[PDB]
């Protein structure tokens, strides 16, 4: 029997965790796709945009209103931009795991996997000398075998699954890996983007009604008490207007008394400390 | 030949009809599209919400309004699920009949359709003690002999058909089945569902346009007088800002005094005590 | 190839207005693939078109004394010929629409003369109605096309996006009004969703769709075009819908620069103003 | 190690530049792609109302206003409509080029490009007398050789790629070659367009919608001052409700006292005079 899971305590009088998350995937989700997407200039320059234009922005933001971000940077991101993935970095900002060539988990057998995770921090430590604590899968989609290879190599927590509005302690094996949950609803890729032969039907929102469906996903969450996790892409909500609505949301959010404004790596420490008791979904049987 | 549905006298000085319906499809309806869908963890972990998170926040929200539900559960998130099914029995609300692997019926044979109502009728009494009077097709599709197979079952109704506004006698020979009509408009899928490889484009609409979509549709439905069915999944509108946009929508449907709030099988006794003359639709012919 | 000229309306209008209706109803989806005849949830969908749109439809046009013009594929007259009727009794004109609502796409001309053919004899025999207006099915034809509807005797063609004005088309010794339509102007990328046919899964609020046609429709009045709406009686027949469109007709019928009419009376007025004959021709590569 | 752009002075004391550009595609997009869509009167017709409707009503909008359009015009184009294209030369618009048919790039090696530089300048020399300096690839995609060429044939800027909000200059070796920065949420394509068997899902946008989200980016934009490029298609754009709501913006901008309204030329040979140190993307290397 699959026990939901339950609320947890937060701290200094607050009653809602609120965690502002940027994945840098940049060119990335494209080259693993279809490596001749290289070939393409216009694409690969409005990939490109992310981590030259977007984190810049992004980190002004952040520091304007001394809001910790978490950016999960695929390994191949920190190869391709240097100085962007440095300046997150030397700005204070957690980094955190987001695969190699931001691939695609389905199919990888666990030989594969265990080889894009040295890959990727091996990058994030040549490249910023971070070593992550924390993962997201690429695509947020992972395998039954994952959770194990992210306790193998020490992680501590995952952002990936989607069955809770609360963090957990998903256990794998004899332990567990504090979950940090997500919602496709808190995501700007399915509100902006837009890449020909890629992704995104051609639908473009308004940056106003993206913070409309955040606010309101938001608000709710409030009564909850559970951890909020926004997830933006530089190279998306780093463009002028889409920032500029952030930016106003962010001084909103910043204003809400009952809220812990607070970095992943902070909010798995604070849930950590709590010694939940772990669960885990099994995978489905089929007779 | 075909006449359409006319409108049915609603009980009590009543002149519409309203059922809040919520299909737990959760993990089923992947799993019958591809069994290899059991292998990504997150879409999984996505779909599981709906039973753990989603049917406990819905069931706390018609709690709070005293208002029934009718969940069609696929005999397969019984079994998966057991316990948040169980809990939907405990609170008072009617479980009515969803398949047992969500199954698509296109192309399924009368045995291969008698099979899976045999195989879900079993998952829902073995894990809920419900023996169900409602059916609704997965997808909305079925065959034009699934209406017998129904019948021969003994459904009290199905709601699956969009031919009407107003509930109506599907006609099945000898035996009886009511018919308490949907439309795409009146589901959250087409407003929420976004899953990889599966279904959604990508757009995911606010909470409040798909209730501006669904008062539109109910203020015009009350000068019709018809049933107005709702179906919500929970892995959708369960999640937070859904939830709450749902909450404040049924408290204003509950403050219509004109409007009937009920549950699909006591919308159904109601229609088949008008002993209406049955009717359906032929299979078009080329 | 020169742009269509505004055309005088008459008397003291300075724009024209028709409401139209394609009662495809079931015929796209039978010719795109004959196996939809098999799913009874989707012929259910399809059917509320001539059951229950036509009739509210109708009832709305009636309320404003409006001229309708239903454009009525031959296949929907012989499935649902007391629909097709009731349009006919309450005065509205039937224009054509192929006979199973063919897609003219490889086409060659006598598959499209047997086509006409069999939709004129569909909607005499119906209805005892003789169309002189014709609407492609899927809004496309080929450049031989014209000049069969002239063979065929039509006064109009209502299919072509190449102007906001009404023209004579180039069709050699005989005579073709032009009638231009838009996509923007079309309710079924405001509310088609039919699994397996067509939609993304987006549904639209009738009232974004009343504020896209109203910002045309107001444009249209200072450009002193013909504005024609098209609507499917099985997508703006639902109750929403058809609450905004009413509410829309209302407005509309309070502005007294529009002359609200039917297609064969703008055709009729446009062929009185005797226009040089226009025409695009296909587009020669290399 | 690649920088990003930096923001350029503007004159007259302006903060930001602004630029209405029209892509006058007409059925040159879908010739391309399958030369069967010449059969299709509707959609022919459809297209064709970019030309014939459009073209007229958005030259009497930027006439109203006194309003300098830069008009992308594919060969193809001017030789199917040479009055349309050669009333923009009259009304004192600048002509850029866009290829002949609208080609794609993709897979295009640099003489069949150089090829379609050639047939479009002629087309456009022969129906309009003008020699273009402007430049912007179709469907927004070029390839890593194609600046290059653009500054061999002796071209003044490019206007296709989406790395910056500031206009550059691109790296191109002994040449030089201004890049006037463009974005997704800045063309009308993915707002209205709808042609069946070739672009669009069925969303139509309301005229309000597209104004909103250009109106939040160019709001941004004038307070991070790069030059806000507008595309716009004719057949898209032209239609009564949609040429009256640019109408409307376009009045809405020409009184704002910040901003500098061009032509692409003009902001161009600003930029030119300003003499930035050449800058560009490189192609990702892939192990
Ligand atoms: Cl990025
Ligand atoms: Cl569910
Ligand atoms: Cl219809
Ligand atoms: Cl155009
Ligand atoms: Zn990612
Ligand atoms: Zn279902
Ligand atoms: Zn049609
Ligand atoms: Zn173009």
Same mark, same amino acid.
């Given at each position: 029997?699959?026990?939901?899971?339950? +609320?947890? =305590?937060?701290?200094?009088?607050?009653?809602?965790?609120?965690? !502002?998350? *940027?994945?840098?995937?940049?060119?990335?989700?494209?080259?693993?796709?279809?490596?001749?997407?290289?070939?393409?200039?216009?694409?690969?320059?409005?990939?490109?945009?992310?981590?030259?234009?977007?984190?810049?922005?992004? @980190?002004?933001? @952040?520091?304007? *209103?001394?809001?910790?971000?978490? !950016? *999960?940077?695929?390994?191949?991101?920190?190869?391709?931009? %240097?100085?962007?993935?440095?300046?997150?970095?030397?700005?204070?900002?957690?980094?955190?795991?987001?695969?190699?060539?931001?691939?695609?988990?389905?199919?990888?057998?666990?030989?594969?996997?265990?080889?894009?995770?040295?890959?990727?921090?091996?990058?994030?430590?040549?490249?910023?000398?971070?070593?992550?604590?924390?993962?997201? /899968?690429?695509?947020?989609?992972?395998?039954?075998?994952? +959770?194990?290879? @992210?306790?193998?190599?020490? !992680?501590?927590?995952?952002?990936?699954?989607?069955?809770?509005?609360?963090?957990?302690?998903?256990?794998?094996?004899?332990? =567990?890996?504090?979950?940090?949950?997500?919602?496709?609803?808190?995501?700007?890729?399915?509100?902006?983007?837009?890449?020909?032969? !890629?992704?995104?039907?051609?639908?473009?929102?308004?940056?106003?009604? /993206?913070?409309?469906?955040?606010?309101?996903?938001?608000?709710?969450?409030?009564?909850?008490?559970? /951890?909020?996790?926004?997830?933006?892409?530089?190279?998306?909500?780093?463009? %002028?207007?889409?920032?500029?609505?952030?930016?106003? *949301?962010?001084?909103?959010?910043?204003?809400?008394?009952?809220?812990?404004?607070?970095?992943? =790596?902070?909010?798995?420490?604070?849930?950590?400390?709590?010694?939940?008791?772990?669960?885990? @979904?099994?995978?489905?049987?089929?007779?």
């Amino acid at each position: 029997e699959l026990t939901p899971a339950a +609320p947890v =305590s937060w701290p200094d009088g607050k009653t809602c965790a609120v965690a !502002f998350t *940027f994945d840098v995937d940049a060119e990335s989700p494209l080259l693993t796709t279809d490596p001749a997407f290289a070939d393409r200039m216009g694409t690969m320059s409005h990939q490109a945009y992310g981590p030259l234009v977007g984190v810049p922005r992004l @980190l002004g933001i @952040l520091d304007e *209103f001394n809001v910790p971000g978490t !950016f *999960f940077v695929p390994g191949y991101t920190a190869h391709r931009h %240097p100085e962007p993935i440095r300046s997150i970095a030397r700005a204070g900002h957690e980094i955190a795991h987001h695969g190699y060539l931001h691939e695609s988990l389905v199919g990888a057998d666990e030989d594969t996997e265990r080889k894009i995770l040295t890959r990727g921090i091996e990058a994030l430590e040549e490249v910023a000398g971070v070593h992550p604590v924390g993962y997201r /899968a690429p695509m947020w989609e992972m395998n039954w075998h994952t +959770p194990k290879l @992210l306790a193998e190599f020490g !992680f501590l927590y995952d952002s990936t699954l989607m069955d809770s509005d609360h963090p957990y302690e998903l256990a794998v094996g004899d332990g =567990s890996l504090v979950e940090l949950p997500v919602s496709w609803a808190l995501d700007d890729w399915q509100q902006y983007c837009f890449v020909p032969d !890629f992704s995104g039907t051609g639908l473009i929102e308004t940056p106003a009604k /993206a913070i409309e469906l955040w606010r309101a996903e938001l608000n709710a969450m409030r009564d909850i008490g559970g /951890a909020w996790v926004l997830t933006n892409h530089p190279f998306l909500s780093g463009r %002028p207007g889409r920032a500029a609505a952030l930016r106003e *949301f962010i001084a909103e959010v910043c204003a809400m008394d009952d809220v812990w404004v607070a970095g992943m =790596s902070q909010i798995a420490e604070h849930v950590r400390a709590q010694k939940l008791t772990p669960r885990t @979904l099994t995978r489905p049987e089929l007779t």
